[model samples]
Target: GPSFPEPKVVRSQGGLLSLKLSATPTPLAIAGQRATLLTYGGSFPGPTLRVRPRDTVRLTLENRLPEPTNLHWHGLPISPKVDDPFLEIPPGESWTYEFTVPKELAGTFWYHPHLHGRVAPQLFAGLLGALVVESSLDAIPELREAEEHLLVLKDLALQGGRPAPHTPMDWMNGKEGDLVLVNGALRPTLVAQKATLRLRLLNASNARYYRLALQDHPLYLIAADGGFLEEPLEVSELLLAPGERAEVLVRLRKEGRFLLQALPYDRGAMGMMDMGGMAHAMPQGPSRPETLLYLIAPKNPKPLPLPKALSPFPTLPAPVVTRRLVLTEDMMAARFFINGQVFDHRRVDLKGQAQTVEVWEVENQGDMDHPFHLHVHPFQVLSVGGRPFPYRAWKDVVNLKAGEVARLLVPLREKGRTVFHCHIVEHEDRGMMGVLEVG
Candidate 1:
């Protein structure tokens, strides 16, 4: 089991936070071996930003790397000029970013490099971190009595103790890391009180998905990608894609050990075919038992009752407009396209009226999955393959499985020209993206 890491925390002050973050080149010292890493504040996966709703952040970003890079608040509903991926910071330069985090929505979000053509390598060298907005979930007396922890899981493909070479196949199929890192450690164990444990889980991998589950225990989920669900969902397993987050409460009942495991998931025959021939012959099914961490209960844990309900989420009415977009790719992985065209700065693939609700049918026609992500306004996954689900939590990123279609209801609350793209930075950089316009 991996030990818990105490990442640097920046707490908001008077509804404001002033921070200076530098993205520089460093040798990542992990497990007695070192590899070159592009880091923020010289740390893998950077620092955690803790802020409340309505908190304003004045951050100065310094670029000490040899190339251009930009930061994006992955799941925040902010504008292009302030927190979007289009803003570029070149090498040997510095820029001041001032933005306000809305107090209306409180959940787990993340920030990372969103620069085109370089996001994959840069992130592989570890350039990601977490953002926490105070939803005041901790205000509950029961929650206060329990322990709180954050699990930032990152996967990196290493070669000879260094960052691995990304192949063309890696782009189409998405780079799968050989090593799993939980809070910057290898399969670390976390010690917790013999009580309720509140976990904020973030999947920071560039292009990997995890079939997460607690061995012999139930995972009581309270939140999803954006914020709290109207009611809690109890489950034994969860599937978290890149750029996703899950907040759950685990009851460490009694003196025992439980592992948080990522089981192997089968994506069907075509999915296996997409991965290459070797994947077909390899051990297929739930992966070998690899534990992210063990939850150690030193003594008989106190029996606790779950909250009957969590916070409520607003529902969207009929959409004012609807759009259809198809995602596709070729065998050789020449390029990725949306609506049969590559990304363009001047081309607006979608348009919406201000303050109007829009429904978009995002379909992945290709043989491999893509994590479809949009900037600014958040959306709810209305349905997938025409199957409506009861859980309607908001999300800024949704994974479109190969040959699967998802209906998204996006409120065009923030009017501006920006982008929507595949969260796989490699695919996004290879033109799997387009622009959106709202007035």
Candidate 2:
């Protein structure tokens, strides 16, 4: 495997911070082969942003590429007017973003381009990154001594030697690149002591869902999209959808050797399964479960104690407004819809009053799964297919499978307009999204 630097970290200055970024065309060396790509801060997986709670960021992006683009703080709670995804930065121009990182928004998150048709292509070309809202993580002493690795998951295809172009099939079924990566490497290797270490994972894929596992080891879940969980849950695998982030603490045990792998999972009606235009012969594909990378440790290393608790989440208030929406797709028309309507840029699908709560009922009616995502704020999963999420998790993206319902309890922020849509870049590119207006 070719060696590249880990994602660079940029820290906030004073109580405010500004980063002058460029969405420029650059040649990215991958797996020892060079491929042309679009990047932020001139690096693949972009830069890892580190900020403190209550900090304000003045982020500026210079669109130097031939086309227009804009940035979306994927899991931030900023209103649309100031950080609207619909607002585009034309080629040769620049746009500045200002938003506050409230203490409650502390955790592992990400940022990427949210332009309608370019969402997938841009990110596929390497225009995405990690965002960390640092708070009291050190409260867990083991975390103080643990090694850190920002494991960013992204995929893309290389035709001959260059990145592959998007195909019609990519749009209908959502793009699933054959090339799997971790921190931009085809098969990157990670190392740690026998003690527990932290893995901040961000699924930055366009249309991929991963069931992750470590050989003979369990992941102690410490945080999710919104932030740290009240207590860590040990699990053998994780169903992480695109645009979702999770923090896991893994301790090395048993044999001295171990590996991190992505397991195969059937999306069924949740993926390319509803192809009204195709037959059942070619079934919807699943990400083949395979070892992506290995984690090396020294012999005779000793294990460490896991934290009893990480962080606590506040109880949410009752919903003041409730609405339901369904995910629909028409292969014949090659169109996707939410709530029976295509995206009307000028239309506002839902409303929320400041300081109030909202319960959204989302369903997938098509023969595939839609990873529903909302901009500006994160929500707690109230129920999935009518079953409560045993442990509360604040999420900005939740997988909604066909023939199933997912209800979300969102605490509305002050006032602003933003958007909520399927994180499948292809789906969002084709109108499977809606606007959110809060007053």
Candidate 3:
């Protein structure tokens, strides 16, 4: 159950990638006890910046808790007030953040607290991290001699020890966390050796929806939330919804203890409610198959050879305009909308034109499952309930369910604002969300 650690990368020296990140409140130790929670520089899934494609970055963000926060890089395309979630950072004040890293963008990005109504309890009390970019498929040779492993995938819950407040069904079922972390430990193991491992993965929870697998192997996939993936597709499970990001590779031939898991994903029925006394304040415990990472691999595995081809996969530019959105939810008044309005960071809803290409669609209609997200460019899903997306990645998060729809083409090349939510940070802090200007 222990042995994990990883999260403290921070690379990019000459090309920049500076750093600072405070967000405080610290105290660590989770699945085994002790819990203070609400971190960032003080750990619990914080460090790991990495950077590469066109580098630059900077970052600073102090905000030692108590209230207002900001940071959002997640799936970087950069510019838009430079990853601005409407710039907040209040508390003890701080804020630097520059941003350039988009020459072409490698993959597996993250960093949290897009503050709207306190982004799901300060990202379920952790502030979040992991950003990696590192292009040229990491100078391939089965990925620069394999064995990578970033893996953030978080989740928490606690109660007396702390962090476990939200409960109107945790903002109507979007706060899953019965302690399922990975880089912040808990069931974490990872000790691989015999060849290709890679495994980036970053569903830094706020609504959990992994479905990733590895018990018998077969992963291979190779990058998704805006990077790689032009070939390498083996699968055997994958999914990852809440603010997705996947990388995969796995080929450890004769591994000893494997596990990895997440499997059971329903993401729908949260229907019949009542909650007078908050129905005993539900805390999260239904979707099964958990396990999370374990890997081990004590020798005997060697034949690594995936990565047949892995870059070019974009091609969008044809949508003049289409829009749509939808995603309702209200549950009496707990909130959450998107086409019925709600989040109004001064209101814009949608608009486009910076570089063209539009489409959007979205839909969901509500009962469960939302995911959706979108901030600085990164789109191209092209279909979901109507089928289509067999390949061709790029996404910045897209799940939908309950009546489903998704379509997206995006490509607005940054001209102004940013937002488009439902990555379920408690229904993007109780209102689903929207904004997006460009022009």
Number of the predicted model whose lDDT against the real structure is largest: 2
Question: Can you tell me which runs of candidate 2 are displaced by over 4 Å?
Answer: 1-5, 269-282
Where does model 1 exceed 4 Å of error? 267-289
Candidate 1, residue 393: the lDDT equals 85
In candidate 1, what are the lDDT values of residues 1-439, reduced to their tens digit? 2257746778989988999999997787764568777788778878899998889999888999888998988888877778766778989899888888876788899888888788888887788888898868768765667678888988887786667878776665567677888877787777885488888999888777778998778888888888887777888888788888988888876777788898876532123343654534221333355678877876767746887777877856778888999998864554889999998877888878878889989999976668899888889898886788558688888877778899999988677888899887778878898999889
Computed on alpha carbons, the lDDT of every model, listed in order, comes to 0.80, 0.81, 0.81
Q: What is the TM-score of each candidate against the true structure?
A: 0.93, 0.94, 0.34
TM-score of 1: 0.93
Spell out the clash pairs found in candidate 2: 77-376, 269-367, 269-368, 270-368, 270-369, 271-368
Top candidate (TM-score): 2
Q: Quickly count the clashes in candidate 1.
A: 8
By TM-score rank, best first, the candidates go 2, 1, 3
* Candidate 3 colliding pairs, count: 0
> What does the lDDT come to for candidate 1?
0.80
TM-score of structure candidate 3: 0.34
Error of 1 at 120 (Å): 1.0
288-355, model 2: which lDDT tens digit per residue? 77666788765665667887877677877777888898899985455899989988879998877978
